[PDB]
From Swiss-Prot, chain A:
Disulfide bonds join 1-23, 6-12. This is Spike protein S2. Precursor of the fusion protein processed in the biosynthesis of the S protein and the formation of virus particle. Mediates fusion of the virion and cellular membranes by functioning as a class I viral fusion protein. Contains two viral fusion peptides that are unmasked after cleavage. The S2/S2' cleavage occurs during virus entry at the cell membrane by host TMPRSS2 or during endocytosis by host CSTL. The gene is S. It comes from the Viruses.
Swiss-Prot record, chain B:
Attaches the virion to the cell membrane by interacting with host receptor, initiating the infection. The major receptor is host ACE2. When S2/S2' has been cleaved, binding to the receptor triggers direct fusion at the cell membrane. When S2/S2' has not been cleaved, binding to the receptor results in internalization of the virus by endocytosis using host TFRC and GRM2 and leading to fusion of the virion membrane with the host endosomal membrane. Alternatively, may use NRP1/NRP2 and integrin as entry receptors. Changing residue 48 to T: In strain: Omicron/BQ.1.1, Omicron/XBB.1.5, Omicron/EG.5.1. Glycans are attached at residues 25, 27, 33, 45. Changing residue 48 to K: In strain: Mu/B.1.621. Binds to host ACE2. RBD also interacts with the N-linked glycan on 'Asn-90' of ACE2. Cleavage of S generates a polybasic C-terminal sequence on S1 that binds to host Neuropilin-1 (NRP1) and Neuropilin-2 (NRP2) receptors. Interacts with host integrin alpha-5/beta-1 (ITGA5:ITGB1) and with ACE2 in complex with integrin alpha-5/beta-1 (ITGA5:ITGB1). May interact via cytoplasmic c-terminus with M protein. May interact (via N-terminus) with host bilirubin and biliverdin, thereby preventing antibody binding to the SARS-CoV-2 spike NTD via an allosteric mechanism. This is Spike protein S1.
Length: 49, 49
């Protein structure tokens, strides 16, 4: 968000933290998807010790 | 890491925390050579508009 929502502007970033945790959730939600893709490949292929 | 995760004991693993952004060296202002004073100041000196 600090780069996408605001163009690395210290004035805009102050307004972004004013909105609370609408960007910690998206970072966390996308992180769950990222670790999920690496897990999905494990069951499909990593079946042999 | 223990700041963004909001605790004192972080578990083993990787954690996305922030981003690395360099900062500008100097400031550049580029304008056309022309700097002819503008004749709309003479409008202020006028009486009948």
């Amino acid at each position: 968000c600090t780069m996408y929502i605001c163009g690395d502007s210290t004035e805009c970033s102050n307004l972004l933290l004013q909105y609370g945790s609408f960007c910690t959730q998206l970072k966390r939600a996308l992180t769950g998807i990222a670790v999920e893709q690496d897990k999905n490949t494990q069951e499909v292929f990593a079946q042999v010790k | 890491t223990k700041c963004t995760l909001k605790s004192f004991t972080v578990e083993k693993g990787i954690y996305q925390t922030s981003n690395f952004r360099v900062q500008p060296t100097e400031s550049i202002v580029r304008f056309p050579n022309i700097t002819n004073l503008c004749p709309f100041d003479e409008v202020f000196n006028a009486t009948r508009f």
